[PDB]
Write a structure and sequence with these properties.
- Chain H: It is found in: Virion.
- Chain H: It comes from Rotavirus A (strain RVA/Monkey/United States/RRV/1975/G3P5B[3]) (RV-A).
- Chain H: This is Outer capsid protein VP5*.
- This is part of a larger assembly, with 2 copies of chain A, 3 copies of chain B and 3 copies of chain C.
- Chain A is an all-alpha fold.
- Helices cover 48% and strands 2% of the residues of chain A.
- Chain A has a two-stranded antiparallel sheet.
- The longest helix of chain A has 17 residues.
- In chain B, strand 6 and strand 7 form a beta hairpin.
- In chain B, helix 1 packs across helix 2 and helix 3 packs antiparallel against helix 9.
- Chain C is α/β, with parallel strands linked by helices.
- The chains are: A mainly alpha, B alpha+beta, C alpha/beta.
- The interface between C and F is large, with 35 and 37 residues.
- The structure holds zinc ion.
- Zinc ion binds next to loops of chain B.
- The site of zinc ion (ZN) has 2 residues of chain B, from loops.
């Protein structure tokens, strides 16, 4: 409501906030890191390419690796390779409910269910929502029935598109298959999945969808069944707390 | 079903009593039984698996008998035997597992799998033998409709329940009175608290009570009862009943006064103990009632007097409690306990083969959910499934 | 209500309906009590207004807050009819008025139940550590005479008040305490005073006496044995009055959270019977 | 458990518990409010006393009943400090003072919640059919000026009160009602008046305005649509004042039964208020 | 081997872990968003912090199966072996830690210690059929 | 992070490293020394300090003559600083503001009152100003850079929150911009963020019934170990006690980790 | 057992419930958004509330199957057992409530009461083949 | 199973192959509509059969 050319220049101000924040610059970086990759010359502040060859996404992260100490190798790259893999990629191309689409939902929700929202506040708050929503989260890439899961921050696994399974995970096989293929915003991840597959019983049919993070098949359960699924979901809402 | 049983004790008493050396005479009675089997089987054909991630496997039979000739046993004799056993082992495993997954509402007691349904057939009954395995022992006695019974160490009769009840409360939660508890497995801990230390209570005594209703009767129970609930003897910040805020619990413990434990059966007191801590026997009960009081100390040294003022704020919260543990007991119904692997075996086979949730058991064979709504169907299915797990563990662990 | 009987459920669902400050911002009222000197030092015709806009920051809608001016601890003590949902009263210790202050705190910070007393016709008796005689008015002067079990004086003649024992000489608020379980012929100066028989108890889930000055301690206990320190008893370091108010505003919620509404359905809490 | 959290389950035990009047005779107080003219017509120095002995008949112990003298509907309508458990107020039909009477009834017969208003610094607005402005004092004169969504007058200049709209000219009790959801700069004569913002809640389980004379009315609804007739609103046919009191005494219980416990004051409360 | 075999989210009571070599317990302390005065008083905005917020978990393995021999709360094997060695003043050898110390043994449970332990446990069990 | 393994291996002593390696600086008021009236009191106490275990060249004696000057100049010289304060009832707060500074760890930046109107951010962002005569007037700005109860143009409409103090920790409603008007000629005002406390001072208070507030809010009252109190008799007695209990006082403090860029 | 087996939304008439131990009826009263004067008059904005808005449901189990014996509207078993006991002044025993009271019996339908009831009902049915 | 919400009036249920009128369900309809892809039936039953 109200909006005397507020939500207006404000839908514009909400803009004039975005292009000056987390999501902004970051996306503006990956972009260059490609141009500057092929085009000019790879700013070699040390650079690796865990995978076939150089390609911003994989490598530029494979290298850099700033501000994350106290554990094991893999995790650190995975992580730093997550950072762009995630967020950054989303504002581009992918399937099923994409994290943010769970976020937007949070916003268009409260920003209506609220009472304390004058125009001045509209900006920022929206922006800030992006930078601080679903602190972490991971992704996956299927290829020959092999769920490769870059559990951002920490963790990482693999699966048979059929039986699921803690099969060798490799910074390599990972490298490429990530770089240029479609990714998936793993709504529900392993933990919830394996626990789900057992005390329960996921038809090959379903499962195959529960990966692409299909809207339907997911909606079903949460709507129908109600076991676990209703936490992996909910917990996320609770996470987009900002 | 009983059929199944034999198949194993056959193999066990086999893979056990048959070795490079011993005299024939010690197995004569055995050897026979064995062969008898091979015969009845040969010619028949089977099928196991087909559900979830469980492989489908077909089996056929065409085996030679056993040399009832020899005096002693030569190495060669064994190896030619062990080779035949291993096919049956790898068989039974697949048979058990296949019937250890299927559930059924209507008749959740009888066999399910194409594999077993075929066994209950009459032509195979020619194999039963030595039913001393505690579980089968009780499986039979139940068919003939008679008094069964099992043995358990730290039984699992209490569904997990951890909560509180505020008998006196107010928004600030600065002068509460009530109880908090943890019922889980074979143990109960309950504390009664009164922020006012019974300052305005009749006889300066606040009465507390905790009642726990078992889903099945336990007989012959050996129980440890101790004063105090250590679990509720430390400072806590707890969520309010409505979840809208949090309250502070800062206990100071006093001895529970006029402790009375009653083990009731259908509303009748079967056993009652007044302030008796240590080991007590409850011979038959479906309910436990713990009554205890907080009595304001009539005489207090300065340090004590300082904790209990005549007016708020009440900063030290008088608490009395009890701890009760059922070490062992007998139940006419199967239950999970702290020693038997049955529940874990059934749950594990289902998890490993990604068996879909069925119509009888709660997702994941969740114990709390199961015991909370322990219907006749769940019990019949549980017993069938536990008995099969026990048959399997005679050969495969 | 109608309901207390039949206990709540103690199950630890464990959910905590987030916030609580967002319901109080919308639905409650905040009343600030200060002394004249406080406002005089501020010297602005718009201080109440400026602070109000500043109060929107902390989350209180325009028509929400207020400002009530007591000019002395003595006057503020007697005709205190706490007006709003939440009352935070500013007191700047004055060292000679300490007990005046103590008696006033004892009244606001606590929940009181009173009945009227007829000093003229009846000879009565204080019952427990919670039965006190709270009298207040223009000039309260109370003389007492303890009676033995015969209606006879003990160190006094129930006939000549010149033998009575004076326990209050012209105060504006007085909470009198006598040896429990003994009858007393009372002689108050009812012309300028009113004395009522009160039973104590419930505290106040509102006030928040904020003390300015000294090295402040208060002793609600009429006894010697106890000393209660509650959250609704805060203290601020004196610099200037503008600073005091800035702090009160900058920490409104913190101060409100130390109280908590829901306890305020009476004009004045001199509970009448 | 105090937390005004509620549950109760109505099994029909059907134990119809007996009397009810024998708890009220022992534990409660009865306060009779009348006008001066009432007592003046009685002309006895012992009327309060005679009636009191007569009250023992109906079952009220000596020290139980109190007699409060309002001399006018306007003054009585002022501080309203109902003294006793049960209050039955006698109102003599004065036809010119009808609304004075209506405004006073509306206050006693009902449960009110108020906050203070600062006419000086903040222009207010009423929220629902239950948010009213009850002002009272020596001489209450209220002028109002409706504000559009800019803090600008509508038919008035928020600067000169000579353009305001007068809605009360020197009353002793006034319940003002304005178009809901509109801000108004208010101009009361705070010198002699006090105006407070009240939200109407529960009703009163005490008063029992007994009306003498007319044919009668006194409607307490501000709207036009509703007309509520409650039990705590009784009427008596005037003859002589002695007769009125005799009847009030001869039917004390009947009158009390139409009121009872003043629920908002009942001990048993908490989150609901006292 | 790094793979999640069983996972339980906030499930207290009895749970089954069918095959594992590692247990990982993750839990959080969340500052109460709503606090009564008594609670608020424990958690100030500035130090000194005098009441220390603590969250915890308790996990007990009631029963399990292991492919290797282990000591447990019911079997007397470890105690039998340890007791015979102590009674006869048997000198410390090259395989077992001094006193057959369980913690030391399980901490560095080498193949040699396990093979010797199994041999030694099996003999203890043979002995207990006749001599207890 | 440190490994958490517990197996007890007490260090034994602690005080024998501090006796050897650290300095102790005693701050007192002039009146304190004047009452002592000896040309060798600093010396006598020093020999007495060897008893408690502090080598000759170890202990230093700094003379503040007032709480106001000392409050400005707390360029704490030694490893351990124990400051003696005299209960002056009119100066209480001055004392509070000085305690708040020594007892705590502060981070500050400079403020240009002339060109940029500021705002405090959290319960830890305060404006600490100090000097000859500190007089601070403030004017809150609405979201337009316009006054609220003031004209950003005439300081005669500002709100005075400090009239000529020697040390002042000013607090304004968080999240609001303010045009500030300090008397920069004699004052210096800097924007500080609070935090770490001090593992040194040990304000020892002489006299009163010494309870005093050191928080800006009303809700909290913090009582730390580095805040001690002694019963006044004579100054010689005070010092004897400080010496007789040096270690006890030192133990209530103990060497700093601040990686403070000011040094 | 807590699981929805059958659910019907606003379906009046004949419905089938195939297996259940609990019935849950949920329904609402919705204030009419549009009211003629006569209706509007019943529902004022302020008390007194003199006409009390009420919504309801009626559910009748015409027939069903139960694994346990029960009394119903056609069989004479309960009446036969109760009648024989009453006619011969049989003293109250340890199992059945006084007078074979149905409400008391079904309220606390213990295994013992059910086994005795079944035995006793089966005998009543054997008797009714010859004696009615 | 072609579920056809013939707006305004009508509604039919097929069997994607050998077409066939057949019980239409407000239920089966409910969901399968809510969250799945729909189709702007260019040509509908009438024309199709
Ligand atoms: Zn045990």
């Amino acid at each position: 409501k109200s909006t005397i050319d507020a939500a207006k220049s404000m839908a514009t101000s909400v803009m004039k906030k975005f292009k000056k924040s987390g999501l902004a610059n970051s996306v503006s970086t990956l972009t260059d890191s490609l141009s500057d990759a092929a085009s000019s010359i790879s700013r070699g502040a040390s650079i690796r390419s865990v995978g076939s060859s150089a390609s911003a996404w994989t490598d530029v992260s494979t290298q850099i690796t700033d501000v994350s100490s106290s554990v094991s190798s893999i995790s650190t790259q995975t992580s730093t390779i997550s950072r762009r893999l995630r967020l950054k990629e989303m504002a581009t191309q992918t399937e099923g409910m994409n994290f943010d689409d769970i976020s937007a939902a949070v916003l268009k929700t409260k920003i209506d269910r609220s009472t304390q929202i004058s125009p001045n506040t509209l900006p920022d708050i929206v922006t800030e929502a992006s930078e601080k929503f679903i602190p972490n989260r991971a992704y996956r890439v299927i290829n020959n029935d092999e769920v490769f899961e870059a559990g951002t921050d920490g963790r990482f696994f693999a699966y048979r598109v059929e039986t699921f399974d803690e099969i060798p995970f490799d910074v390599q096989k990972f490298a490429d298959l990530v770089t240029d293929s479609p990714v998936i915003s793993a709504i529900i991840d392993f933990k919830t999945l394996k626990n789900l597959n057992d005390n329960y019983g996921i038809s090959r049919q379903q499962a195959f969808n529960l990966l692409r993070s299909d809207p339907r098949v997911l909606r079903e359960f949460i709507n129908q069944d109600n076991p676990i699924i209703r936490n992996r979901i909910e917990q996320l809402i609770m996470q987009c707390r900002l | 079903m009983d059929v199944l049983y034999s198949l194993s004790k056959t193999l066990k008493d086999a893979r056990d009593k048959i070795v490079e050396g011993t005299l024939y005479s010690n197995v004569s009675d055995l050897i026979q039984q064995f062969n008898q089997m091979i015969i009845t089987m040969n010619g028949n054909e089977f099928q196991t698996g087909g559900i979830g991630n469980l492989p489908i496997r077909n089996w056929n039979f065409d085996f030679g008998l056993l040399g009832t000739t020899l005096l002693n046993l030569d190495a060669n004799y064994v190896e030619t035997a062990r080779n035949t056993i291993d096919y049956f082992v790898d068989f039974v495993d697949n048979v058990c597992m296949d019937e250890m997954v299927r559930e059924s509402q209507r008749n959740g007691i009888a066999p399910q799998s194409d594999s077993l349904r075929k066994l209950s057939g009459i032509k195979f009954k020619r194999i039963n033998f030595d039913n001393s395995s505690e579980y089968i022992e009780n499986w039979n006695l139940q068919n003939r409709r008679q008094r069964t019974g099992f043995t358990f160490h730290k039984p699992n009769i209490f569904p997990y329940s951890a909560s509180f009840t505020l008998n006196r409360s107010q928004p600030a939660h600065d002068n509460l009175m009530g109880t908090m508890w943890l019922n889980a497995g074979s143990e109960i801990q309950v504390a009664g608290f009164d922020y006012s230390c019974a300052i305005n209570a009749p006889a300066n005594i606040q009465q507390f009570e905790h009642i726990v209703q078992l889903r099945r009767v336990l007989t012959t129970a050996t129980i440890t009862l101790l004063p105090d609930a250590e679990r509720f003897s430390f400072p806590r910040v707890i969520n309010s009943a409505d979840g809208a805020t949090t309250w502070y619990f800062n206990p100071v413990i006093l001895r529970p006064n006029n402790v009375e434990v009653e083990f009731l059966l259908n509303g009748q007191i079967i056993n009652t103990y007044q302030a008796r801590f240590g080991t007590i026997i409850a011979r038959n009960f479906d309910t436990i009632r713990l009554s205890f009081q907080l009595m304001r100390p009539p005489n207090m040294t300065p340090a004590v007097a300082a904790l209990f003022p005549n007016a708020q704020p009440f900063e030290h919260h008088a608490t009395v409690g009890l701890t009760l543990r059922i070490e062992s007991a007998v139940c006419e119904s199967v239950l999970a306990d702290a020693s038997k692997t049955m529940l874990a075996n059934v749950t594990s086979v289902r998890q490993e083969y990604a068996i879909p949730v069925g119509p009888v058991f709660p997702p994941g064979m969740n114990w709390t959910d199961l015991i909370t709504n322990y219907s006749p169907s769940r019990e019949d299915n549980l017993q069938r499934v536990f008995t099969v797990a026990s048959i399997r563990s005679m050969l495969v662990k | 209500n109608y309901g207390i009987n039949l206990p709540i459920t103690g199950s630890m669902d464990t959910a905590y309906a987030n916030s609580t400050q967002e319901e109080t911002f919308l639905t409650s009222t905040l009343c600030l009590y200060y002394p004249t000197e406080a406002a005089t030092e501020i010297n602005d015709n718009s201080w109440k207004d400026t602070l109000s806009q500043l109060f929107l920051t902390k989350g209180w809608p325009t028509g929400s807050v207020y400002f009530k001016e007591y000019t002395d601890i003595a006057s503020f003590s007697v005709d205190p009819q706490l007006y709003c949902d939440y009352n935070v009263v500013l007191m700047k210790y004055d060292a000679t008025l300490q007990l005046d202050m103590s008696e006033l705190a004892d009244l606001i910070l606590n929940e009181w139940l009173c009945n009227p007393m007829d000093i003229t016709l009846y000879y009565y008796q204080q019952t427990d550590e919670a039965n006190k005689w709270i009298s207040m008015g223009s000039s309260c002067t109370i003389k007492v005479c303890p009676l033995n079990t015969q209606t006879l004086g003990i160190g006094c003649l129930t006939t000549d008040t010149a033998t009575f024992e004076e326990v209050a000489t012209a105060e504006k608020l007085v909470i009198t305490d006598v040896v429990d379980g003994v009858n007393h012929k009372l002689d108050v100066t009812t012309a300028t005073c009113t004395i009522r028989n009160c039973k104590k108890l419930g505290p106040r889930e509102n006030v928040a006496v904020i003390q300015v000055g000294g090295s402040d301690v208060l002793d609600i206990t009429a006894d010697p044995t106890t000393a209660p320190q509650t959250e609704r008893m805060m203290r601020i370091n004196w610099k200037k009055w503008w600073q005091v108010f800035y702090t009160v505003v900058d920490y409104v919620n913190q101060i409100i959270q130390a109280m908590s509404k829901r306890s305020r359905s009476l004009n004045s809490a001199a509970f009448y019977y």
